[PDB]
From Swiss-Prot, chain A:
Component of the NOP7 complex, composed of ERB1, NOP7 and YTM1. The complex is held together by ERB1, which interacts with NOP7 via its N-terminal domain and with YTM1 via a high-affinity interaction between the seven-bladed beta-propeller domains of the 2 proteins. The NOP7 complex associates with the 66S pre-ribosome. Belongs to the WD repeat BOP1/ERB1 family. It is found in: Nucleus, Nucleolus; Nucleus, Nucleoplasm. Component of the NOP7 complex, which is required for maturation of the 25S and 5.8S ribosomal RNAs and formation of the 60S ribosome. It comes from the Eukaryota. This is Ribosome biogenesis protein ERB1.
Curated annotation (Swiss-Prot), chain B:
It is found in: Cytoplasm. GO terms for cellular component: cytosol; cytosolic large ribosomal subunit. This is Large ribosomal subunit protein eL8A. Present with 238000 molecules/cell in log phase SD medium. There are 2 genes for eL8 in yeast. Component of the large ribosomal subunit (LSU). Mature yeast ribosomes consist of a small (40S) and a large (60S) subunit. The 40S small subunit contains 1 molecule of ribosomal RNA (18S rRNA) and 33 different proteins (encoded by 57 genes). The large 60S subunit contains 3 rRNA molecules (25S, 5.8S and 5S rRNA) and 46 different proteins (encoded by 81 genes). Keywords: Cytoplasm, Ribonucleoprotein, Ribosomal protein. The chain holds residues 53 to 239 of 256 of the full protein. The gene is RPL8A.
Swiss-Prot record, chain C:
This is Large ribosomal subunit protein eL15A. Residues 141-157 have a biased composition (Basic residues). PROSITE patterns: RIBOSOMAL_L15E. Disulfide bonds: none annotated. Pfam families: Ribosomal_L15e (PF00827). Belongs to the eukaryotic ribosomal protein eL15 family. The gene is RPL15A. There are 2 genes for eL15 in yeast. GO terms for cellular component: cytosol; cytosolic large ribosomal subunit. It is found in: Cytoplasm.
Swiss-Prot record, chain D:
Belongs to the NOP16 family. The modification Phosphoserine is found at S21, S23. Component of the pre-66S ribosomal particle. Interacts with NOP7, RRP1 and RRP15. It comes from Saccharomyces cerevisiae (strain ATCC 204508 / S288c) (Baker's yeast). Coiled coil: none annotated. The keyword Calcium does not apply. Its main location: nucleus. This is Nucleolar protein 16. Keywords: Nucleus, Phosphoprotein, Ribonucleoprotein, Ribosome biogenesis, rRNA processing. The chain holds residues 156 to 228 of 231 of the full protein. Disulfide bonds: none annotated. The keyword Phosphoprotein applies. The gene is NOP16. It comes from the Eukaryota.
RNA sequence: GUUUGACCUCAAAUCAGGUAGGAGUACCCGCUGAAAAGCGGAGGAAAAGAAACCAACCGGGAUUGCCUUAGUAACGGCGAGUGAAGCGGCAAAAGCUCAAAUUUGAAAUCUGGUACCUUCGGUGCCCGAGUUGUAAUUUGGAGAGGG
């Protein structure tokens, strides 16, 4: 037959995350890979392959 | 045609049969004005396009090319978050202040844990109607998920009242009928 | 990530939601052809652990077979149909009393993403022509039964091989 | 032994190596830090402006010592 | 008493086509002469001349097509290399020399060294 | 039925391989540096033997990494386990002697 | 708003670019199979191949092949006879890649078109593909974050 769903496990709420994963450095500082792409464009403009 | 015949015969065979209650939580979704204000919120937090990204990159790169190293200062980018594994990743920290969930995904099973997962994690989820409308606010075709974490101080008070609005409109209205087996009525 | 959710939910097949989706989708696929192209993997996590990537050069076919094995024959059908494609792998999705359904990942060695990107360029080699025809796939190696273990002995084709060991005689220049 | 000695000299021969230098922007950045804070590291570690990547305490020392050996004693 | 190849390289295409018309008329005359003749050596020369004229004309046309298709990243298939089955296929050098970035970093970090034992 | 008529020939070809490979590998030996390893199986447990590769921990005890040691021509087996003391020590002395006799070009 | 638009699906293209077939087939790999034939699929080899292994030892260490194990173990109207494998010695030796937790301070990824260029390609620009996940990093022998 059919019957409504039991929510035994949802009703207890986790006050904490699952994983104790340490926070990375790059989440706090300006993005590095952005800056590498910036310096790529800088090298292309120094070679004049990209016009300002 | 065949495909018109099947796409009309689809959603008949669904509603004719008993749907499990972990489905039909979908289409018990957000009403008109609240979804409207949610979109007004998230269009304030559109992510940067590839063109706008590359444009700012060319600006700062021409700056360094002159050099003319102007300063080293930028607060953070704030935007919506839209990668599905990234959306789940922002939960289980928790970081998701609001989550929008599209009702229509063809592999529904990608999505079905997310209401219960934000339920147990206490994240204010809301089921939105249409992943195309998610993709529009995130410069994709579809997105099917929409997480939002970081908000400016100008918008933070609007955020909290939107959360209270959703928890009044969604968590109070549809919670018991979420448990019930939907559909089953023939066509 | 969300793939662990999909896998653990996938292990509970006769649970109500999965049999609901299964029962809808078997009728829905019954509307369509024996063989057709699926837009996306219905079980993406299973496709990932079989090696799917979401880029150009990855084609997903959905194939219907009547109840060799059924899975290997399902691979042979789409191998015969899309000859330009190379069959990566395949997996079960759904079944009926009349038919089982399989979802097969094929890879094109003609697309430049596949011809570059050295994780997958090995499949452009002409020794990888029709791996399902020689049973070089995963289900092919299982039905050939090729592993390490004393449980694995001389079986069928290898049996003829060791029959070959009994059939041929080896002689040296100086007789031993 | 003889050709062994010749190859032993060749492997014993130091190659003409180049010192790994510094890039102009980041040594200029170090030069800004050298005039802003001086030499002390706990102040420049908790500096927001011109330490936005929040460099490690001693990476700062390593780069400054390399910069000083390169230029400015 | 025959044509030369290099003499035809200098000529314009209308000169070559008119030369062709001349040789075909000469052939048509030599057939009428040869139906009386048991052995006429001149027709064997002039058919080789017609062949060389066609060679130079086709060569100039093909090289003109190559020059107009020079810049493009494509070619008509007949103008491409012939080599064989599957040397058309399955790899270029660039598509074979291509390696992942991780193994690139590994070979940079630890290349295969040169050493000599017993020293 | 098969007769090894090529037994004389293949050896020649094999030494051609042992010539030709050696041509490419001109200073280096053809073979890697293999461990000296005592055999199983009580019929053979007094016998010592050439082994496949040493281990990670032994190469660390030699004072280098296995990723670098493969570039030096030292065969390394991860799935072996060092359980005897004298085997370990003798193979460490072997590694040290191999380190003493090599000269490496930059 | 009876309008307009996102998608999604499905069609159509004398649209662009590619690719499949057939022959041969000594060797290889699958399928079928009598008293071998046949079928299908490749290559210069193919297959197999880096242990859910073998062992019981003072343990060994991807696969492959040779000698030995050995006409032994085992099987068999235990009749006809069938018929291995561990170890050892040798040849050859080589190891690697994914899939699981976020780059979220910026999809960082790629096909294609075009313009040039030093063209088995490169650069630029633009369409697209892609978050229902393309890159970097990590495959337990750990590894990652930091310091």
């Amino acid at each position: 037959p059919y019957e409504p769903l039991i929510d035994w496990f949802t009703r207890h709420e986790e006050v904490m995350p699952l994983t104790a994963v340490p926070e990375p450095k790059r989440r706090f500082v300006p993005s590095k890979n952005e800056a590498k792409r910036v310096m790529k464009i800088v090298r292309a403009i120094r070679e004049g392959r990209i016009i300002p | 045609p065949e495909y018109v015949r099947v796409q009309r015969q689809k959603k008949i065979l669904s509603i004719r049969l008993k749907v499990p209650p972990t489905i039909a939580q979908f289409q018990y979704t957000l009403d008109r004005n609240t979804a409207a204000e949610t979109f007004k919120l998230f269009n304030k937090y559109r992510p940067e396009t590839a063109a706008e990204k590359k444009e700012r990159l060319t600006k700062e790169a021409a700056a360094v090319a002159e050099g003319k190293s102007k300063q080293d200062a930028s607060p953070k980018p704030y935007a919506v978050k839209y990668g599905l594994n990234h959306v789940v990743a922002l939960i289980e920290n928790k970081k998701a202040k609001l989550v929008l969930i599209a009702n229509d995904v063809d592999p529904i099973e990608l999505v079905v844990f997310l209401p219960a997962l934000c339920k147990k994690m206490g994240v204010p989820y809301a089921i939105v109607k249409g992943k195309a409308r998610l993709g529009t606010l995130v410069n994709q075709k579809t997105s099917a998920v929409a997480a939002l974490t970081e908000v400016r101080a100008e918008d933070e008070a609007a955020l909290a009242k939107l959360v209270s609005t959703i928890d009044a409109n969604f968590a109070d209205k549809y919670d018991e009928v979420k448990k019930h087996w939907g559909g089953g009525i023939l066509g | 990530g969300a793939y662990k959710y999909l896998e653990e939910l996938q292990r509970k097949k006769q649970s109500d939601v999965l049999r609901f989706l299964q029962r809808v989708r078997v009728w829905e696929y019954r509307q369509k052809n024996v063989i057709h192209r699926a837009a996306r993997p219905t079980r993406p996590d299973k496709a990932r652990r079989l090696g799917y990537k979401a880029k150009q050069g990855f084609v997903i076919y959905r194939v219907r077979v009547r109840r060799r094995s059924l899975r290997a024959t399902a691979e042979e059908r789409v191998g015969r149909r899309a000859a330009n494609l190379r069959v990566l792998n395949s997996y079960w999705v759904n079944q009926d009393s009349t038919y089982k359904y399989f979802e097969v990942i094929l890879v094109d060695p003609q697309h430049k993403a596949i011809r570059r990107d050295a994780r997958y360029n090995w499949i452009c080699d002409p020794v990888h022509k029709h791996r399902e025809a020689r049973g070089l796939t995963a289900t092919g190696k299982k039905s050939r039964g090729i592993n390490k273990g004393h449980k694995f002995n001389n079986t069928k084709a290898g049996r003829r091989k060791t029959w070959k060991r009994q059939n041929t005689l080896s002689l040296w220049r100086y007789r031993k | 032994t003889e050709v062994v000695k010749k190859l032993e000299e060749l492997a014993s021969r130091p190659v003409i190596r180049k010192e790994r230098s510094q890039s102009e922007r980041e040594e200029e950045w170090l030069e800004k830090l050298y005039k802003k804070h001086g030499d002390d590291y706990k102040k420049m570690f908790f500096d927001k402006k011109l330490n936005i990547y929040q460099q490690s305490e001693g990476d700062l020392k390593r780069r400054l010592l390399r910069w000083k050996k390169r230029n400015g004693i | 008493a025959g044509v030369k190849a290099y003499e035809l390289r200098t000529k314009s295409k209308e000169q070559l086509a008119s030369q062709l018309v001349d040789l075909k008329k000469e052939l048509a005359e030599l057939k009428v002469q040869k139906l009386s003749r048991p052995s006429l050596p001149k027709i064997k020369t002039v058919r080789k001349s017609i062949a060389c004229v066609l060679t130079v004309i086709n060569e100039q046309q093909r090289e003109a097509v190559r020059q107009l298709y020079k810049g493009k990243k494509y070619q008509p298939k007949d103008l491409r290399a012939k080599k064989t089955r599957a040397l058309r296929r399955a790899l270029t050098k660039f598509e074979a020399s291509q390696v992942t970035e991780k193994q690139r970093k590994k070979q940079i970090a630890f290349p295969q060294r040169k050493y000599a034992i017993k020293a | 039925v098969k007769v090894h008529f090529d037994q004389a020939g293949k050896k020649v070809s094999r030494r051609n391989a042992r010539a030709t490979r050696a041509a490419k590998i001109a200073p280096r030996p053809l073979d890697l540096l293999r461990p000296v390893v005592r055999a199983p199986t009580v019929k053979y447990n007094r016998k010592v033997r050439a082994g496949r590769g040493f281990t990670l921990a032994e190469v660390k005890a030699a004072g280098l990494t296995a990723a670098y040691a493969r570039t030096i021509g030292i065969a390394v087996d991860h799935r072996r386990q060092n359980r005897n003391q004298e085997i370990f020590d003798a193979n460490v002395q072997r590694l040290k002697e191999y380190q003493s006799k090599i000269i490496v070009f930059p």
